[PDB]
């Protein structure tokens, strides 16, 4: 199926206490595989997935240098954004960058991405044509005009149609036993009385990969999407995720309610009841 490769980077100024903190991670789909923290002794990119430890010393060397260089450029950009917005050097600010690529079943590129955010809001984003920029404000338009002078979109497009797709397919082949298996969710229904006339039905979906999951409660075939507490999907400490959906029903009418679970790892959509 379709697969993703993304790099996230975060730089945070630390006025008074020292250099900005820079932390970057790489994800293949929902599997983290590289990390880097500038606060280490001698900061170095490290493998967080088994299929990436295969790479040789030149790989980790070039990655380590790229991450240190990105930290330097992030300090540069933080100072520049300080002077763009006429802000105070005593305030802490955040810069967040993501970039990457989505490939299809045929391994062909569908979309490339490159986005930058300042203080948690969109700053500038490479359009889908890989040829234009969306700027969020006039400061981002300054940056846009400086980046159009430097053909940053052309460098990015050479990278995305080239090295991104190639190395994503490489990573996929390397660890296909894990990355290409869809772990179906273990599903069950729990019952917890809250009063003499009411009780919670909780629908679980433990043990699944990827994270994309659909949990729905239905009362006699009518969706209860407003009367259903639905929690965010969370990691289980491994590459596996968890998620549940609860509805509070009167004690006596449990069999009016049905849970419905949809996952990539399931052959058919599932329907569950409390037994």
């Amino acid at each position: 199926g379709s697969h993703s490769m993304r790099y996230f980077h975060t730089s945070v100024s630390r006025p008074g206490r020292g250099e900005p903190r820079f932390i970057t991670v790489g994800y293949v789909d929902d599997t983290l595989f590289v990390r880097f923290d500038s606060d280490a002794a001698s900061p170095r990119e490290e493998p967080r997935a088994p299929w990436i430890e295969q790479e040789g010393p030149e790989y980790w060397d070039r990655e380590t240098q790229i991450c240190k260089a990105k930290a330097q450029t992030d300090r540069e950009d933080l100072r520049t954004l300080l002077r763009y917005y006429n802000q105070s050097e005593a305030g802490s600010h955040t810069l967040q960058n993501m970039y990457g690529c989505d490939v299809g079943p045929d391994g062909r590129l569908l979309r490339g991405y490159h986005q930058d955010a300042y203080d948690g809001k969109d700053y500038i984003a490479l359009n889908e044509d890989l040829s234009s920029w969306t700027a969020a404000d006039t400061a981002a338009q300054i940056t846009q005009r400086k980046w159009e002078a430097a053909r940053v979109a052309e460098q990015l497009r050479a990278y995305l149609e080239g090295e991104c797709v190639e190395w994503l397919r490489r990573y996929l082949e390397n660890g296909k036993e894990t990355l290409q298996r869809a772990d179906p969710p273990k599903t069950h229904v729990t019952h917890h009385p809250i009063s003499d006339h009411e009780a919670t039905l909780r629908c679980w979906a433990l043990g699944f990969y990827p994270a994309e999951i659909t949990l729905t409660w239905q009362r006699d075939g009518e969706d209860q999407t407003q009367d259903t507490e639905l929690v965010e999907t969370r990691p289980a400490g491994d590459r596996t995720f968890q998620k549940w959906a609860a509805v509070v029903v009167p004690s006596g009418e449990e069999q009016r309610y049905t849970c419905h679970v949809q996952h990539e790892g399931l052959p058919k959509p599932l329907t569950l009841r409390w037994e």
């Binding site: 790489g26 790229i66 260089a69 990105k70 450029t73 460098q155 990278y159 991104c164």
Partner: peptide
């Protein structure tokens, strides 16, 4: 592998 802007 990672990308790096020109400069």
């Amino acid at each position: 592998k990672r990308w790096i802007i020109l400069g």
